[PDB]
């Protein structure tokens, strides 16, 4: 297993305010089902993306997904654990901040997950029931694949 979040998002915006980065665009996405707001920075020339694109986003602690730590190292000879390669676009980063709506006595009902993918950021807002798997300073893999 080793899965943290699985959903299909809808690209509603690309350039809300303006374009600040040539090779990197910001995806403002809304989710089906869980109703999970998403903001994500995606390399453009490497992985083109347009408005109204069905893409399946997966958050995973490890790529192997059989339940073993990846020790955070890049080795091209790592084929033998049968890496999850069903996705076109794969990122790697860490959670740097998790915000919430809790106020003293009351618990948080909506959480925001902030992940830095080595410089590219994503914000993920939604109900805490499915977002509690995120922990600060924890390694995260982003998996991306367009849908028809």
Pick the binder of other proteins from 34, 90, 110, 146 (CB under 8 A). Answer: 90
Which are the contacts of 85, defined by CB distance < 8 A and separation ≥ 6? Answer: none
Which are the contacts of 51, defined by CB distance < 8 A and separation ≥ 6? Answer: 11, 12, 13, 14
Position 146 contacts other proteins (CB under 8 A): no
Contact call for residues 91 and 46 (beta carbons, < 8 A): no
Stretch that binds other proteins, among 5-13, 16-24, 30-38, 49-57 (CB under 8 A): 16-24
Q: What is the CA radius of gyration of the chain?
A: 16
Q: Which is nearer to other proteins, 67 or 76 (CB)?
A: 76
Contact call for residues 11 and 47 (beta carbons, < 8 A): no
Position 80 contacts other proteins (CB under 8 A): no
Pick the binder of other proteins from 37, 65, 121, 127 (CB under 8 A). Answer: 121
Position 98 contacts other proteins (CB under 8 A): yes
Count, residues near other proteins per rule CB under 8 A = 50
Interatomic CA distance for residues 63 and 55, integer angstroms? 19
Position 17 contacts other proteins (CB under 8 A): yes
Position 118 contacts other proteins (CB under 8 A): yes
């Amino acid at each position: 297993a080793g899965i943290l979040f699985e959903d299909i998002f809808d690209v509603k915006d690309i350039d809300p305010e303006g374009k600040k980065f040539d090779r990197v665009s910001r995806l403002h996405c809304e989710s089906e089902s869980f109703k999970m707001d998403l903001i994500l920075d995606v390399n453009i020339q490497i992985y083109p993306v347009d408005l109204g694109d069905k893409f399946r986003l997966v958050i995973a602690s490890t790529l192997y997904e059989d339940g073993t730590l990846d020790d955070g190292e890049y080795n091209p000879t790592d084929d033998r654990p049968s890496r999850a390669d069903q996705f076109e676009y794969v990122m790697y980063g860490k959670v740097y901040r998790i915000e919430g709506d809790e106020t003293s006595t009351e618990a948080a009902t909506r959480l925001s997950a902030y992940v830095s993918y080595g410089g590219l950021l994503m914000r993920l807002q939604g109900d805490a029931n499915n977002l509690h798997g995120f922990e600060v300073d924890s390694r995260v893999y982003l998996l991306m694949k367009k849908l028809a």
